[PDB]
Write a protein that binds this ligand. Structure first.
Ligand SMILES: [Cu+2]
Ligand SMILES: [Cu+2]
Length: 287
């Protein structure tokens, strides 16, 4: 309950500065790199081998995997500056703006802005601009710059709306067999955004573009973590509203997807992270 994860649009200027500084330190110490790599690894871990499902996406473990990923990230932040917690990007309200790219999240003192079409959509403003911030490709080799291209695709010209979020919150089952991209009446799948896709979490990736657009190499962009903090909150809100439901599958899903299975690359189980308050943190909205 102690750590409070705040909306980005509410943070003081000094708070935004301290978050950025701490991420920059993490990167400099080489700690940031481990999080980009953990993510690419998990996506190449299919469950079972040959299938679409992987340790971190396109199945039941999606939500607990990323909650565990963010928890560890935030712990590392905390090591550097005990007063720093993970904010969340409330994309569904930015969606309501005339030009969501005008959002305060994209200012030069925070995330930086959109990509420069003259330079192949290389980002050149903000603390993460090419030259200030090195990036890595899928193979682990330098790629030479953060890229972004807001709303450029025909699939995802807009962020998801407050209605999309409310509607996913109405779903009664946490997931359904066969626990994959085709799962119907499934909260995990709806939030993941496959149903008439891309929606919700997937749609946000496509909207940002650049490294965010490609699931390996999505965490090269600090914004990845604000997006996933917002996804963690929506999940947290759902758990509150449907206190009677629990994670599924409890058993008989593919190994790595069940309630008491280790989530590659770690030993942590979905059970280990089910109660977000027992992990030491809460979202401002609860309070
Ligand atoms: Cu991911
Ligand atoms: Cu994601």
């Amino acid at each position: 309950k102690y750590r409070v994860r705040k909306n980005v649009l509410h943070l003081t200027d000094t708070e935004k500065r301290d978050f950025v500084r701490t991420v920059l330190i993490l990167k400099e110490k080489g700690i940031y790199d481990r999080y980009i790599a953990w993510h690419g690894a998990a996506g190449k871990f299919h469950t079972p081998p040959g299938s679409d499902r992987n340790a971190a996406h396109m199945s039941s473990a999606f939500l607990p995997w990323h909650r565990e990923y963010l928890l560890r990230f935030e712990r590392d932040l905390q090591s550097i500056n005990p007063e720093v917690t993970l904010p969340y990007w409330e994309w569904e309200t930015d969606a309501q703006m005339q030009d969501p790219s005008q959002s305060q999240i994209w200012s030069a003192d925070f995330m930086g802005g959109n990509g420069n079409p003259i330079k192949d959509f290389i980002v050149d403003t903000g603390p993460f601009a090419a030259g200030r911030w090195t990036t890595i490709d899928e193979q682990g080799n330098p790629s030479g710059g953060l890229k972004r291209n807001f709303g450029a695709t025909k699939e995802a010209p807009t962020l998801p709306t407050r209605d999309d979020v409310l509607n996913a919150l109405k779903i009664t089952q946490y997931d359904t067999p066969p626990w994959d991209m085709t799962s119907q009446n499934s909260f995990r799948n709806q939030l993941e955004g496959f149903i008439n896709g891309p929606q919700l979490h997937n749609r946000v990736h496509r909207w940002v573009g650049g490294q965010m657009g490609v699931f390996p190499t999505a965490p090269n962009d600090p914004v990845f973590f604000l997006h996933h903090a917002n996804v963690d909150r929506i999940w947290a809100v759902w758990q509150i509203i449907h206190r009677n439901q629990n994670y599924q599958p409890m058993k008989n899903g593919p190994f790595g997807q069940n309630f008491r299975d280790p989530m590659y690359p770690w030993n942590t189980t979905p059970e280990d992270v089910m109660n977000h308050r027992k992990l030491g943190y809460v979202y401002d909205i609860e309070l």
